[PDB]
Symmetry: D2
Subunit: 268 residues, 4 copies
């Protein structure tokens, strides 16, 4: 009955139940998908969080900066899904940028070591995961990553904006590689969502009026979006990622779908 | 379990069983939608074409330049679907440009009367169909128009390129109106498909260069698309339109979804 | 030694001494250009206004909707500039939209007759003027038109936004034709300037909240521009046009240069 | 008389007399500018090369990955130009990418260490040069970097495409900081030019595919550019950079000017 009936899908990036990846996983499961999950660092917490999903799925450790984790990933996925089976979908929902690279911290004062780490995790890892997983993906498959529209500069997002610009470019080359396997590669550019990264990384770097200034972001985004925007609701974004993982967008690759309430199409 | 089960959808633009609109109607019916079709000019002929669809659907006359057809449209649709019921979707799959505006005919020699006619039918009509139909659309509903990426100039498409550019802009303003109703408005920028218009209009205006240009279009597009492109197969485009008509892209509006094999994301 | 020393340049669009074209003309003559001016409708007024320029230039009548004017234009310019001389530059600084297509007047209520007149004058005439003048332009020549970034929808600009979208597309096709003559074609997307068109057309259609709403546009453009924006100063825009008329951007064609304080590059 | 008469301009990125920076330097001196040059590593040979410019100019060592070099840069330039004098122009004409990041080497096989070096040099350094030099730049001044349009993926350019996508994003935030000083920041996206990096980095990484790949690049570019394109001629690009360094584009910042024959505005 489900949009993703029978499909085996790897989903990275769950840390809490407000994670975009959590809702992607939840919707994908409501739609009949069989999941393999990956988690970073706080595996015990992640285990407890994933207990809240509609169906239990194996959790595999993946630090995208750890070459050993990347080299063993496909083997460990095959152990979880069974020999002779392959993935139909992969979700990259991963990002990091040091505090120096965000908020009210002067753009010029972020050392390259920090920026590099951020670009490693948030951009290059999209290609790493594709490298690791394409060899175990079925024709008609779909790789999806999460974006935040970086076409224009803005307060606060700072070097993460630069990392997203890189990610968009990486996705276009991932499409070229993926196409050899009959696999699509796309990004979903989401509007703002109240996640752990929002409050701890972005909010943490904004200093004092962070609470009110995020409320400004919500109000302004919902005003610009012709159909409105709810920062408390990741479901519209999760649904969009599932549309891309499905058979219903079979001719879209190297591309970006905007799940932002149409805010990026309006100036005011 | 159909993607569009229960949905009432108006589909304009069928003229042959190669029409992008025809495959849109076919796929939508396969997925449980209940359709109303609109046709232009030769309605007796169109009815024999629509007879080839999987299921019966009422066929309505609509010339988008005819003010009376537009003023009566919502009432005629309401009769077709039953008083009390509203539309969940609307598909604009219509375009025209006079020969002077196309092909090897010099760009400078198209009189404005001819360009204006093409822009009326191909761009302005997206707004006039939205005006007529929004008052009989449900929240969560979806308006979708057909686009051919006009961001760059090219041989042969000439003034139709300009009409498409206008249409993309018209779509962003329709989104502002549609949102007041909880309705989304998007275009699908399709790759090249073997349809009547490509033959009679584009081919016709290319004269002796039609063959070489159409061949280059078939193979060049496939070459550039990372997942490839079958110009003889409208299904991938029709599926993309159904995705937009569905509940699975609920946060996208005023936007363009590219069902072109990824070709627009690659230079070579 | 002036930027445009010895260049023969046609400049359209002067109506008042606040007109963008007036400032283009002044800066161009300050830089050694020999001008021919074209005016519409109010020829006695334009003659008077142009008496304020650094040098007296011949003024020719041109209503871009008048086929006879267009058909006789090259002949009339050749008279103004001398037989055996050709133009080095052409400036299109022309636009119109009926009130129904602007301001607080509902988008859906603008009749196509109104929209078509707006598009004729604002977009199609860029090609009309190129058709007329390219046969009397020197290699290395430059055609420049005035744009307002229409990539996103916005309040008030309405159907003019659609006309500018069309204009951008027209410019790319003009470039194809102009290249056959060794001539470049480009647009300058300017930020908001206090001109007759701004007060009469835009402010006129904004109703009672107009003078203040226009002030709020200034405030927001200036805030978004990393280098600020002064709506009272056309000179930075005129300078940019002069740069495109000069020999200093010889590799730029089919393109758009933004003289907008950089506001389009920033989200907030 | 000269376009840049009286201006003091720093030009980085000279490595051979085919360097785009060499032609920028030459044209700038021809136009009355006083230069300070920076070079990397091979300073003995760079000095030999700059002795062939029309005018004498101080040459300073700058490795952009060297923190000590950047920390001391403003003081060294001040020594070169005289205390109390400031720079009106800065040209960043610097890029690097390891071979593994380029050509026919598999996109997925580039280790992050290699990509990170390329991004540091090719993108981050645009920000570090701005950080170092803005304190000694005059209001009305101009920072210009060199781009190659990375909006679409393509053969061979591989991870350098990613670095350019990052660089474009960096330029937009540099614009925010530069505007506090009354300074503009922009990129010139150049068409392809035969330089040391083309030969050694791009051509070297293509191997047996270099001939065919570069022929198609060159043929396609000249075909698409409405005014044509000559890969052997850096002067149009050098002129465009000088236009940006001048007073003639005073309202453009955070932006990208294309010196590419108009190629990017045309599909074919
Ligand atoms: N929250 C928003 O408003 C928003 C908007 C647009 C895009 N995004 C993108 O959505 C994605 C999900 O972020 P979120 O908002 O759900 O935040 P989140 O805090 O819920 O998730 C971020 C994830 O990044 C993972 N991560 C960090 N370093 C990692 C590493 N080295 N290896 C593997 N995983 C690592 C963390 O474990 C965490 O699970 C990110 O790409 C984010 O940039 C978020
Ligand atoms: N075929 C392609 O390669 C292609 C690619 C991208 C986008 N498109 C767009 O797809 C849409 C459908 O085109 P298609 O290729 O299926 O061609 P088609 O010939 O099958 O359909 C074109 C339709 O336009 C309708 N039409 C013309 N004038 C009309 C009027 N006054 N009122 C109402 N309808 C009118 C025709 O009757 C016909 O049904 C158009 O917007 C077209 O530009 C086509
Ligand atoms: N003022 C702004 O904020 C702004 C911003 C960006 C772009 N522009 C563009 O700059 C250009 C000049 O406008 P402006 O702001 O200087 O206003 P303006 O009123 O000074 O100039 C508009 C000109 O258009 C001419 N025109 C109208 N109909 C014509 C016709 N049929 N034939 C020939 N000419 C006709 C008018 O006579 C007038 O001279 C237009 O393209 C406009 O869209 C203006
Ligand atoms: N050649 C083309 O077709 C082309 C086209 C568009 C853009 N570009 C860009 O133009 C710029 C100049 O390239 P080019 O083609 O003239 O090649 P080039 O080889 O002449 O110049 C590249 C410069 O980068 C410098 N560089 C490398 N590492 C450095 C470091 N650590 N510190 C300081 N400098 C360092 C090199 O010394 C060299 O001077 C680059 O940004 C390049 O990406 C080149
Ligand atoms: C106020 C600035 C506007 C941006 C807010 C939206 C947002 C929130 C969180 C996001 O995720 C991250 C951001 C930075 C670093 C890491 C992650 C996952 C993210 O990518 C985007
Ligand atoms: C070089 C590219 C030329 C072929 C483009 C593909 C195409 C084919 C048909 C299309 O439909 C029309 C084109 C013109 C007029 C009317 C219609 C429906 C259309 O909009 C696009
Ligand atoms: C509030 C809307 C956004 C600000 C508009 C700035 C502007 C002002 C005048 C312009 O010129 C015209 C506008 C409409 C019709 C005709 C012309 C010449 C124009 O093109 C742009
Ligand atoms: C076939 C590849 C596509 C055309 C490349 C044109 C080009 C050539 C050289 C360029 O400069 C560099 C490229 C890589 C690394 C460093 C530099 C300076 C560059 O940035 C662009």
């Amino acid at each position: 009955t489900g949009l993703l009936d029978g499909k085996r899908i790897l989903v990275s990036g769950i840390i809490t139940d407000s994670s975009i990846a959590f809702h992607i996983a939840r919707v994908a499961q409501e739609q009949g998908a069989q999941l393999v999950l990956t988690g970073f660092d706080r595996l015990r917490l992640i285990q407890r969080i994933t207990d809240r999903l509609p169906a239990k799925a194996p959790l595999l450790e993946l630090d995208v900066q750890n070459e050993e984790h990347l080299a063993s990933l496909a083997g460990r996925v095959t152990e979880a899904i069974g020999a002779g089976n392959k993935l139909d979908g992969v979700v990259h929902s991963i990002g990091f940028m040091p505090q120096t690279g965000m908020g009210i911290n002067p753009f010029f004062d972020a050392p390259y070591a920090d920026v590099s780490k951020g670009i490693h995790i948030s951009a290059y890892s999209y290609a790493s995961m594709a490298k690791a997983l394409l060899p175990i993906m079925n024709p008609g498959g779909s790789i999806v990553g999460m974006d935040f529209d970086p076409s224009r500069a803005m307060p606060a997002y700072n070097w993460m904006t630069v990392a997203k610009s890189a990610l968009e470019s990486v996705n276009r080359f991932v499409a070229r590689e993926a196409g050899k396997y009959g696999v699509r590669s796309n990004l979903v550019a989401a509007g703002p969502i109240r996640t752990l990264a929002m409050s701890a990384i972005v909010g943490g770097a904004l200093g004092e009026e962070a609470g009110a200034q995020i409320q400004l972001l919500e109000e302004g985004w919902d005003q610009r979006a012709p159909i409105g925007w709810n920062m408390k609701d990741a479901t519209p974004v999760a649904k969009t990622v599932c549309a891309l993982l499905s058979d219903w967008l079979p001719a879209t690759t190297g591309d970006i779908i905007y799940a932002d309430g149409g805010a990026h199409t309006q100036l005011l």
